[PDB]
Amino acid sequence: TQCHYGQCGGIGYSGPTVCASGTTCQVLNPYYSQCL
Numbered sequence: 001t002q003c004h005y006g007q008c009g010g011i012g013y014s015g016p017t018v019c020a021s022g023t024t025c026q027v028l029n030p031y032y033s034q035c036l
Contacts (some may be wrong), residue, residue, distance in 0.1 A: 008033045 002008045008025035009017050010033045019035030021026045027033045030034040 002035045004035055006035050008035045 001023070002019045002023075004020055006016070007013065008019050009015060010027060010029060010031035012020050013033070017025070023035040025031060025033050026036050
């Protein structure tokens with residue numbers, strides 16, 4: 001599960017795309033999305 005302040009991933013991310021329960025995957029950049 002993607003951790004708080006972890007990259008849930010933007011375009012081309014093949015890792016943990018699901019954020020921790022209570023955190024939301026927020027796109028900060030097209031490729032950088034973070035779980036806040």
